[PDB]
């Protein structure tokens with residue numbers, strides 16, 4: 001396997017990164033420190049995760065120790081939905097930079113294609129529980145993202161949770177300055193994303209797979225819901241390789257030429273999840289895992305399904 005993938009800006013992105021959603025502030029500093037010690041050099045962050053200060057604490061220190069150089073790290077963050085207005089984007093980026101204690105990001109993503117009413121609340125809802133949109137559009141937000149590159153705050157920009165028509169909207173802009181470098185999307189054996197991956201890869205956009213373990217800690221998970229980590233078929237593939245099910249689930253997107261960002265705050269799991277460069281899934285394993293697709297999406301909200309830019313009404 002090679003360990004980084006080339007982006008359109010000429011930078012190389014590590015194919016394995018550490019996710020940080022639901023890594024509690026009081027626990028994430030140690031998580032990130034351990035991750036850097038064991039070899040992670042890509043960290044996936046976001047303003048909405050409410051922990052960027054504590055991630056930043058960890059990074060800055062591993063600099064203070066001389067454990068890693070900033071140029072070796074690949075730090076990703078994301079513009080939250082309440083900041084899609086062109087005049088709010090730079091301040092949102094700068095807040096993330098200040099929290100992370102960094103002078104640039106390697107990649108900055110539009111977190112979702114949906115703009116929400118600006119304000120303090122991450123999820124402004126009306127009295128009936130529907131998200132309150134903003135009067136923003138993908139192209140104007142993208143133009144504001146491009147200014148961040150031209151000001152040196154971020155090295156690359158991309159998107160997350162965009163369907164292929166939303167990607168196309170950006171690509172087709174006459175005055176496009178920067179193509180998206182990455183589309184970060186949910187991807188795992190129960191939601192294999194064959195058509196969107198094919199589309200993105202054909203357009204020279206790198207795909208990052210989020211929730212590769214099925215996000216078992218997501219707050220809306222129902223006890224009856226499928227569980228990747230407990231799937232006995234995946235356990236049997238893992239046993240054949242004397243690996244864990246998590247290790248199989250991480251290796252799987254890597255062999256599809258995807259980037260993958262498993263989350264853990266547990267030191268013993270952070271280290272296990274990185275030990276995926278010493279084995280390969282066979283062609284039969286890959287085919288088998290792909291065959292588990294059920295088009296089963298875990299990361300979506302009912303409250304957002306009426307937004308004009310809700311991404312998941314389209315087939316892909």
Ligand SMILES: NC(=O)c1ccc[n+]([C@@H]2O[C@H](COP(=O)([O-])OP(=O)(O)OC[C@H]3O[C@@H](n4cnc5c(N)ncnc54)[C@H](OP(=O)(O)O)[C@@H]3O)[C@@H](O)[C@H]2O)c1
Nearest residue numbers: 019020021210211212213214215217246262263264265266
């Ligand atoms: N762009 C977006 O809209 C978006 C959406 C979702 C996710 N993401 C990103 O993708 C990252 C990964 O997705 P995710 O956090 O949803 O879920 P995930 O990585 O699929 O699963 C994380 C869960 O698996 C557990 N776990 C980790 N390693 C394990 C192992 N070796 N054995 C058993 N359990 C293990 C974790 O527990 P502990 O932490 O307690 O160890 C945690 O509960 C996020 O953290 C975030 O950075 C982005």
Ligand SMILES: O=C(O)COc1cc(F)ccc1C(=O)NCc1nc2c(F)c(F)cc(F)c2s1
Nearest residue numbers: 021048049081112114299300301304307310311
């Ligand atoms: O982002 C993470 O890592 C994990 O996710 C989350 C992370 C957080 F820190 C808080 C909430 C979520 C969450 O509720 N996620 C589900 C969504 N679905 C939608 C949706 F369908 C939209 F059309 C717009 C939108 F913005 C969302 S957010």
